[PDB]
Amino acid sequence: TKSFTLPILTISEMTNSRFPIPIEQLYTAPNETNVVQCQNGRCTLDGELQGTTQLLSSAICSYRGRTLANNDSWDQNLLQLSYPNGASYDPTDEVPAPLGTQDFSGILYGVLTQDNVTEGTGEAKNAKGIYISTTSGKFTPKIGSIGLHSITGDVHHNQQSRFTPVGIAVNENTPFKQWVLPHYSGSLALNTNLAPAVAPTFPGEQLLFFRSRVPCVQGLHGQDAFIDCLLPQEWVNHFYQEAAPSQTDVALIRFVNPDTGRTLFEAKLHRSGFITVSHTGNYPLVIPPNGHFRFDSWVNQFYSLAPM
Amino acid sequence: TKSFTLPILTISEMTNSRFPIPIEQLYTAPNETNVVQCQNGRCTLDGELQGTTQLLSSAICSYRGRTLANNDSWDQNLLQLSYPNGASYDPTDEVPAPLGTQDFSGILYGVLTQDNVTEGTGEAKNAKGIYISTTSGKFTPKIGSIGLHSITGDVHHNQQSRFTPVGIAVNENTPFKQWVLPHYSGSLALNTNLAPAVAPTFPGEQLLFFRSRVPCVQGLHGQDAFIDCLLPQEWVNHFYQEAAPSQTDVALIRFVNPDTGRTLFEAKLHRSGFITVSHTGNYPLVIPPNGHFRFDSWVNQFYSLAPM
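Structure tokens for the assembled complex are given below, as produced in the milestone run.
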């Protein structure tokens, strides 16, 4: 059997699998009312991608397609989504939405670029500041269309356009809810083909998250906007490449200080692609910057982790 | 000895190592007057990062630091840099510039985000559209500071800030020159610690590039802006992880169709981290979307490739 492995990376050498920014922290907390069911960054340990997960961090929360004028004060345009190649999106694919589609509720902010303009048009005149809100009835990426609310710049009708994500935004009636999935089909249909929700099931355990601060371009004054993922993008890509057979349901892993060899904590890496630790309460881990994970062994369902 | 390998990735499954966007094409061209000496996406086959190369595509052309008011006409603020991971930047570090610094001459466009603002401040009011020009006298990232030119938004003095790249720009006196390295110390000092320039040394050979179209927010009307890299970011990260010893100075690689194994063409993968092919002239390669490179064997500098 091909041996299971992890890449050797410090946490600042990891990318959030739900937004194209580096990991900053490890964080554990109880689920309490959150249904932890993100659709990006989902991969089994033997290499099966799930949800809307694909391999490129530069495609997470990125969209492209053709703009269409829309008679609405919020979504002045729609984006008719296309694959990177240029073909129209196919809603019959067995996925929740185009791969990389945002998997949090609220407003995604970024920049739309369109047909290039002459230099004399002015500075950054082919850059449009855009809000993509999931509370809009026009957010229907599974059907092949999303709504664009423009803030700066004139969005041209019927031009091949790219959206580059920058951060999130909170306005007066649209909170940022990272654990509330969008309705990928709007009100036409419920979500389909979802990666499963995850939770600790062993006494005393909590999920462990790879945590980043996402830029927030409106609202959340004096507050941190966090985006938490279950696997860094580098682990998704590693498991996809390696496709090592999963020998049990749980891979025992440990986070070590490479200088002293000390185990800072051990953790369960579940075969469906998430981590639990033995802890009770909200806890941003205090860990040395050079620490990294190592794979120990495949364990059974009744392994009791050392408290951390 | 650990065997050298390449990741199993199609070209649309890889990221440009000089700008955070997916690869779109393979492209070969003669060097003619270009000094091909990019500093991002530089890595030896045995895993030694060079130039300004680091591991995260989400850090390429990204900057972070503290803003400082400036009385220049072009740059209303400077950004006092750190490393993209947040580690303090010392100009005495043995690098050309902070890792991920842009390695093309011209204008980089993106969005600065700063301290979060109240909802009532307005839409995208913590998003500033920025030009970072390498021809500005304040582009001195090696010294620890770059100039920020405001287009949209009010850049705040003395705030911790993040710059997210979106594309490039061409104004009336600043062309986009992807093979002219910036002066990382401006006119104050010469460039240091550079990864070497590369060129075909064998008869009938040209460099093979991984090519993307970069968004252009001003200028280049009717034209596509291209950014060409020597190695995909995923190859950089793979060589860094594997650190397989290079048995000779040249690895023979084959671009194959994985279904059957038929070789479409062969190429030389050089020890310092670049590819050559046997071709004369500018040529965007025609390749099936499912093809990928595969390591064949170690050869020398005088292996004669089949023309392609």
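The two ends of chain A are 32 Å apart (CA to CA). The longest helix of chain A spans residues 233-242. Further analysis is deferred to the final report.
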